[PDB]
Amino acid sequence: MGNFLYRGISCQQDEQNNGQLKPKGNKAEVAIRYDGKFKYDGKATHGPSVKNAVYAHQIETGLYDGCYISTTTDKEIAKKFATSSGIENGYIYVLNRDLFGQYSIFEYEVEHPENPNEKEVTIRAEDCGCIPEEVIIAKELIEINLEHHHHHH
Numbered sequence: 001m002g003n004f005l006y007r008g009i010s011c012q013q014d015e016q017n018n019g020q021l022k023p024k025g026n027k028a029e030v031a032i033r034y035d036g037k038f039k040y041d042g043k044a045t046h047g048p049s050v051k052n053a054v055y056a057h058q059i060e061t062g063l064y065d066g067c068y069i070s071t072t073t074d075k076e077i078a079k080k081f082a083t084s085s086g087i088e089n090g091y092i093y094v095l096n097r098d099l100f101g102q103y104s105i106f107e108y109e110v111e112h113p114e115n116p117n118e119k120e121v122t123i124r125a126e127d128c129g130c131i132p133e134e135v136i137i138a139k140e141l142i143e144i145n146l147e148h149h150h151h152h153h
Contacts (some may be wrong), residue, residue, distance in 0.1 A: 001098035001101075002098040002101055003071065003097035003121070004078070004094070005067065005071050005095040005096065005123070006078035006081060006082075006092070006093075007092070007096065008082055008090060008091060008092035009021065009087075009092070012090065012091040012141075019026070021093075021130055022066075022130055024131065024133075026126075026131055028042055028043060030045060032050065035068070039052075045064055048128070049127055050127070054067065058128075058153075067128035067129055069095070069122065071121055071122075071123065072120060073118050073120075073121060078094075082142065088142060088143075088144050089142070089144065090141075091139075091140075092141070093136040093139045094136070094137060094140075095135050095137060095138075096112070099135055100123055100132075101137075103145070107124055108122050108125075109122050110122070138150065
């Protein structure tokens with residue numbers, strides 16, 4: 001529900017080796033609130049994970065390095081993303097947004113000019129790089145999505 005998220009990986013090696021897509025190490029476990037000016041801060045320590053630290057880090061330096069999940073307002077993003085990223089030969093997983101809504105995970109949507117007709121909604125996880133392991137409601141492998149729409153061309 002909400003939105004259909006799609007993400008694919010060619011590093012099935014790292015995924016299967018870690019047995020969780022990617023190495024993780026969550027902590028903090030603080031209040032956190034998406035206020036108009038969300039100075040929710042955290043514990044007290046000065047480091048990574050959450051806070052203006054992670055927010056500014058991803059905004060300034062690691063611009064969508066994989067910490068947060070960037071997705072478009074179009075469900076057909078799946079096909080476009082899989083093709084343009086050359087995932088046609090690799091691994092792909094699907095995630096539902098309503099799960100994040102239940103999780104109370106944050107989202108920051110950037111807007112291009114009005115008529116491009118699209119907004120980029122980046123899903124701000126409470127930690128960098130897929131903090132929820134069960135967010136992947138579907139996992140499939142892909143070897144060329146041939147046929148189906150091949151009516152003639």
